[PDB]
Amino acid sequence: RFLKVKNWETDVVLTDTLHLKSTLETGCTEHICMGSIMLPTKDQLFPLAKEFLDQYYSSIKRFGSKAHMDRLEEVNKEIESTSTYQLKDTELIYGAKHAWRNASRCVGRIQWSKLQVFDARDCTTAHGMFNYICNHVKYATNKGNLRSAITIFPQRTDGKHDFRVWNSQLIRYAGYKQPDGSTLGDPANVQFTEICIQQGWKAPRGRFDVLPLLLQANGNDPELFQIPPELVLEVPIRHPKFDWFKDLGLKWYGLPAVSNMLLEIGGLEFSACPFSGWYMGTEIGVRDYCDNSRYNILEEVAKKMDLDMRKTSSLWKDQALVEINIAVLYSFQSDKVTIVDHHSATESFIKHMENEYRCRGGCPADWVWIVPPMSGSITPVFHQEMLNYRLTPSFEYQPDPWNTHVW
Amino acid sequence: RFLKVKNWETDVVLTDTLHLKSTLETGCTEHICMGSIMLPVRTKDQLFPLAKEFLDQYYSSIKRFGSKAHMDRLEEVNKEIESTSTYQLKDTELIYGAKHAWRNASRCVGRIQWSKLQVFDARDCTTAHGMFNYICNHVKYATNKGNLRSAITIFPQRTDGKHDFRVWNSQLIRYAGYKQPDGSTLGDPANVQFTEICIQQGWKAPRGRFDVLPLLLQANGNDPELFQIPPELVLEVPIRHPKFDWFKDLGLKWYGLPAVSNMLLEIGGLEFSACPFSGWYMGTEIGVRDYCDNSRYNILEEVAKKMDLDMRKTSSLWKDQALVEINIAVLYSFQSDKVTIVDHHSATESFIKHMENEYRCRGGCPADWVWIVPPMSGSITPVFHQEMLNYRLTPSFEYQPDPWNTHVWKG
Numbered sequence A: 001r002f003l004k005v006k007n008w009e010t011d012v013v014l015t016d017t018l019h020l021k022s023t024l025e026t027g028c029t030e031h032i033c034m035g036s037i038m039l040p041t042k043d044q045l046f047p048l049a050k051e052f053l054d055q056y057y058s059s060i061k062r063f064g065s066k067a068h069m070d071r072l073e074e075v076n077k078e079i080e081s082t083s084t085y086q087l088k089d090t091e092l093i094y095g096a097k098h099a100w101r102n103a104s105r106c107v108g109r110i111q112w113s114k115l116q117v118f119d120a121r122d123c124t125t126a127h128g129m130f131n132y133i134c135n136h137v138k139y140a141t142n143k144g145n146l147r148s149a150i151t152i153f154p155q156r157t158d159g160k161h162d163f164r165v166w167n168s169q170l171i172r173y174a175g176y177k178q179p180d181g182s183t184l185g186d187p188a189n190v191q192f193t194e195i196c197i198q199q200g201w202k203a204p205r206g207r208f209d210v211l212p213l214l215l216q217a218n219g220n221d222p223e224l225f226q227i228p229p230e231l232v233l234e235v236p237i238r239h240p241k242f243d244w245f246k247d248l249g250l251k252w253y254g255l256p257a258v259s260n261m262l263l264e265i266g267g268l269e270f271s272a273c274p275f276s277g278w279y280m281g282t283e284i285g286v287r288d289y290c291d292n293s294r295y296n297i298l299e300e301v302a303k304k305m306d307l308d309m310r311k312t313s314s315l316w317k318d319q320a321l322v323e324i325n326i327a328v329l330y331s332f333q334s335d336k337v338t339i340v341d342h343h344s345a346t347e348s349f350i351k352h353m354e355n356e357y358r359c360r361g362g363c364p365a366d367w368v369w370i371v372p373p374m375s376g377s378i379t380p381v382f383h384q385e386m387l388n389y390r391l392t393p394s395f396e397y398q399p400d401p402w403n404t405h406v407w
Numbered sequence B: 001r002f003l004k005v006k007n008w009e010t011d012v013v014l015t016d017t018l019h020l021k022s023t024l025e026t027g028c029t030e031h032i033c034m035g036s037i038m039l040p041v042r043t044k045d046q047l048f049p050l051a052k053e054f055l056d057q058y059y060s061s062i063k064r065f066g067s068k069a070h071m072d073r074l075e076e077v078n079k080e081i082e083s084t085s086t087y088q089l090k091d092t093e094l095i096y097g098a099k100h101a102w103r104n105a106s107r108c109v110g111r112i113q114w115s116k117l118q119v120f121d122a123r124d125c126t127t128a129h130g131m132f133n134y135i136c137n138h139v140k141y142a143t144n145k146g147n148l149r150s151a152i153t154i155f156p157q158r159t160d161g162k163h164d165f166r167v168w169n170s171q172l173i174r175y176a177g178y179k180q181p182d183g184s185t186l187g188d189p190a191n192v193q194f195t196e197i198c199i200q201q202g203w204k205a206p207r208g209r210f211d212v213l214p215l216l217l218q219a220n221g222n223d224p225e226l227f228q229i230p231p232e233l234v235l236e237v238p239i240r241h242p243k244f245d246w247f248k249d250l251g252l253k254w255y256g257l258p259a260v261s262n263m264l265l266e267i268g269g270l271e272f273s274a275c276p277f278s279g280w281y282m283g284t285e286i287g288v289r290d291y292c293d294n295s296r297y298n299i300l301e302e303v304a305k306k307m308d309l310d311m312r313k314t315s316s317l318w319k320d321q322a323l324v325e326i327n328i329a330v331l332y333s334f335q336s337d338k339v340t341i342v343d344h345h346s347a348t349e350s351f352i353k354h355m356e357n358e359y360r361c362r363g364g365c366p367a368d369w370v371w372i373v374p375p376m377s378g379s380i381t382p383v384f385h386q387e388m389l390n391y392r393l394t395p396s397f398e399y400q401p402d403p404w405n406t407h408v409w410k411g
C-alpha cells in the first residue's frame, strides 16, 4: 500500500500515499511492465463529478460544508436533467491547473500553480477559435518573456459536435515529400501538411513553413487560418563560437503549444485545450534537430566541425550533439526568449517532487519521459526512483481528427 | 494473447508472445508502474514443478522433447528430489541454464553475445581457498591478455541456506573506497562499506585512490576469508585523451574486466548464490557512471576546469562537454591498449538487431528500457526510440541481500 521511492545519489527516501487515489489504469500488470510504451452515461458521470468536486472543496478547506453539499446536489440534478453539467469558473481553473499538476510526463510541473486559464467555452465558430488562439499566442509569447497558459473550448456533448484543433501544436513547420524521395521540412508533419493542401493552403515549400491552423468547431469541417506572422516569435540559431553555424540556416519557434490533447475534468471532456509553457533546450536541440526521423542534422553539423565520422567510437555524434544544444540555448537566451536547460529543469523537478511528497503525499512521474534525451545520468532525475500512476483531472491522448471526422 | 512493440524511428512493429511464458512478478500493477524502481531454501513441493518446467525447456531446445531420454531424466530428477530434497544438474543443463539466464537478463544490453559464454563448473569446490583458485582461473581466462572472453564460474548451489557459498565482493575486481575523518572519500565511494569490512577482516589497505580490493570469499556457509588477486592477473588501463595531453595527468585508470559477483543464478528451481560472471565493458559504464556520478569518482569539475569551460552557468553545458571528452578518453585508451570495449552506439545498434532476431526466433526479448538506454546521448542511440516489454523469465540472475547483513558468524 505505502510505497517508497529512493534517490540513489542522495539516499533520500520519500513515501508515496497519493497513488492510493489513482483511478485509471497504467497498462502494466504483475506479469509485464509496459513503462516504455508511448500509447499504452449519466451513471458514469455523476461519480466522476463527485470525485472531482470533493477534491475541489477539500482544496478550499470546505470539505463537508453546506456549499460543498449544495453544489454536489446541484450538479447531480443538472446531470440527471441535462445528461451533463457545467463547471464554475473556479472549478475550471482548479481543474486545468491540476491536470498539469498530474501530468506524469511533464518535467516542468514546479510551475503548475502559475497557469493563465482562458475560458473559451462561449466559442461557437472556427473564426472565434482563431481569435481566441491568436490572443493566447500573443499573451503567452509576451515578447519573449513567456507565460504559461491554456485556452479551453466547449466540452464534448454527443461526440458529434466536438471542437478540435487539428494541428498537433499551435505552431509547427510543414513537411513535404520531394521527388528525390527525401522529405522537405519537418517529416513529423508531412501528413498534416498534406491535409492542409487538401484543404487549400498555399504551401511555400520551404524548410520552415509555419503551418496554418486547421480549426474545427461544433463538429463542422475544419477551416484554415494563417497565424499573424507578427505573432509567431522565431529564433535564428547560431553558435557562440562556430560562425559557420548560422550558415546551416536553422531556426525554431519560441512557443511550444501542444494542441491535440484532451482535458478531462470531473468527467467532462474538453477535446480542444491548447496549452503552452516554454521550452527545455533538449526538446529542440536533441529531439527536433537530431532525431533521425526529424530534421536529422547530426551529419551536416559533424562535417562542419571536421570530426572523424569514420568510427562511432570517436563519439562524433555526441560531440556534435552537445554543440547543437549549446547553440539552441545560446540563440534563445541572446534573443531574450524564455528557455530552460535540462540541468536547471531537472533540478527544479526534484525540488518540486520533494514539495509534492511533503504536501500532497506524492507526485506521479514517468521516468522514461522525465529523464532528458542527452546526458541522462548527469541530471538528478536519472538517479531518482519514480512511481507512475494516473490521477484526474488529466491531459489524455486522443485520436487524430482526420481519422474520425465525418465530412 | 499478443502484445506489440513499435520503434518510433523506423515504424517497425514487433509481436511478443514470449511474455506468456513469464511466471515471476514485475512489481507493477494495473494501477501503478514501478518500472524505474531499482529493486522492486525451497521445498520439494515448489521444486519439482520448477525442475520440470526447466527440463521441458531444455529438452525442447535440443529437439528431444517427449523422448525417452527426456522422460527418464524427469523421472530421475523426481526421485532425486523426493529422495534428497534437491537434485543435481547435468553439466549440459548447467551450461544451457547459465546461457539462458544471460539471455533472459532484461537489464543487459550486450545479450547479442549470449550463446558465447564459457561456463566453468565449480560445483566440486569445498573451501574458500578452492574458490580463490577457481576465481583466479576465471580472471586469467576471461582477460585473455586484453582479448576479453565472456565467462561464468558456478559454485555449489544452496542447500539448507546455512551452507551458502558467497563472493562478498560486488565485482571480482573493484577499487577500495575510504571515508576520511574530514568527511571526504579517497577512492571509489561505492565500495566504502565493503572496504571497511575487508580492513576489519585483516586487509592492510594501501589507502590509495585505485587500490584493487582483495577477494573476501565464503565457502559452505563458513566465515569469509581474504585473498589477494595476483597483480599480474589484473589488467588495467591508464586513461589518456587523444587530443588533450593533460588528461593523463588526472591520474585516472580503470580495470579491463567487469565481473559482477554478487548476484544469484536460478536454474530449474536451484539457487547458485556464488556465480561470478564477466564480459567486457561498454564505454559509458566507466566514462559516464563510474567517473561522473556525483556519488562515484565525480571528476566532471576537475576535467571541466582543465578544458577551461564556462562553469559559471549550466546553460553553457560544460558538464555535457566534459562528459563527452571523458568518454572519448576511455574508449581511446582501451582501444589503444588493445583491451576489448564497446561504445554505446555500437552496443545499442547490436542490441536492436539482437532484439529483432529474438522476436522472430523466440517470440520476444524481455528488456528494461530504463537500464538499456545509455546514461548519455540517450536519444541518438536506437534503443531510446524502441518500445520494450519487461517481464521475468527463468533461468535468471537475481539480486540477493549483501552477505554481511545475513551471515551468522562462527568466529
Ligand code: HEM
Residues within 6 Å of the ligand: A100, A103, A105, A106, A107, A108, A109, A111, A115, A148, A149, A150, A258, A275, A276, A277, A278, A279, A280, A283, A340, A345, A369, A395
Ligand atoms: C513552463 C514550462 C514547461 C516546461 C519547461 C515543460 C517541459 C516539458 C517537457 C520537456 C515535456 C516533454 C515534451 C516531449 O518530449 O514531447 C513536457 C511534456 C508535457 N507537459 Fe510540460 N512543460 C511546461 C509547461 C506545460 C504546461 C503549461 C502544461 C499544461 C498546462 C504541460 C503539460 C505537459 C504534458 C501533458 C506533457 C506530455 C505531453 C505528451 O505526452 O506528448 N507542460 N513538458
Ligand code: HEM
Residues within 6 Å of the ligand: B098, B102, B105, B107, B108, B109, B110, B111, B113, B117, B150, B151, B152, B260, B277, B278, B279, B280, B281, B282, B285, B342, B347, B397
Ligand atoms: C559481452 C559483453 C557484455 C556487455 C557489453 C554487457 C553490458 C551490460 C551493461 C552496460 C549493463 C549495465 C551495467 C550497469 O549499469 O551497472 C549490463 C547489465 C547486466 N548484464 Fe550484461 N553485458 C555483457 C556481458 C554479460 C554477461 C557475460 C552476463 C552474464 C552471463 C551479463 C549479465 C547481465 C546482467 C544480469 C546485468 C544486470 C546487472 C545488474 O542488475 O546490476 N552481461 N550488461
Ligand SMILES: C[C@H](O)[C@H](O)[C@H]1CNc2nc(N)[nH]c(=O)c2N1
Residues within 6 Å of the ligand: A036, A037, A038, A368, A369, A370, B008, B384, B385, B386, B387, B388
Ligand atoms: C519508445 C520510447 O517510449 C519513446 O522513444 C519515448 C522515450 N522517452 C521520451 N521522453 C520524452 N520526454 N519525450 C519522448 O517523446 C520520449 N519518447
Ligand SMILES: C[C@H](O)[C@H](O)[C@H]1CNc2nc(N)[nH]c(=O)c2N1
Residues within 6 Å of the ligand: A008, A382, A383, A384, A385, A386, B036, B037, B038, B370, B371, B372
Ligand atoms: C532510479 C533509477 O532506476 C536508477 O537510477 C537506474 C536508471 N538506469 C540505470 N541503467 C543502468 N544501466 N544502470 C543503472 O545503475 C541505472 N540506474
Ligand SMILES: NC(=[NH2+])NCCC[C@H](N)C(=O)O
Residues within 6 Å of the ligand: A256, A257, A258, A276, A277, A278, A279, A280, A283, A284, A287, A288
Ligand atoms: N515545454 C513544452 N511545453 N513542451 C511541449 C512539447 C513540445 C515538443 N517537445 C517540441 O519539441 O516541439
Ligand SMILES: NC(=[NH2+])NCCC[C@H](N)C(=O)O
Residues within 6 Å of the ligand: B171, B258, B259, B260, B278, B279, B280, B281, B282, B285, B286, B289, B290
Ligand atoms: N559489461 C558488464 N558486464 N558490466 C557489468 C557491470 C559493471 C559496472 N557497470 C561497472 O561500471 O563496473
Ligand SMILES: [Zn+2]
Residues within 6 Å of the ligand: A028, A029, A032, A033, A034, A035, B028, B029, B032, B033, B034, B035
Ligand atoms: Zn510498469
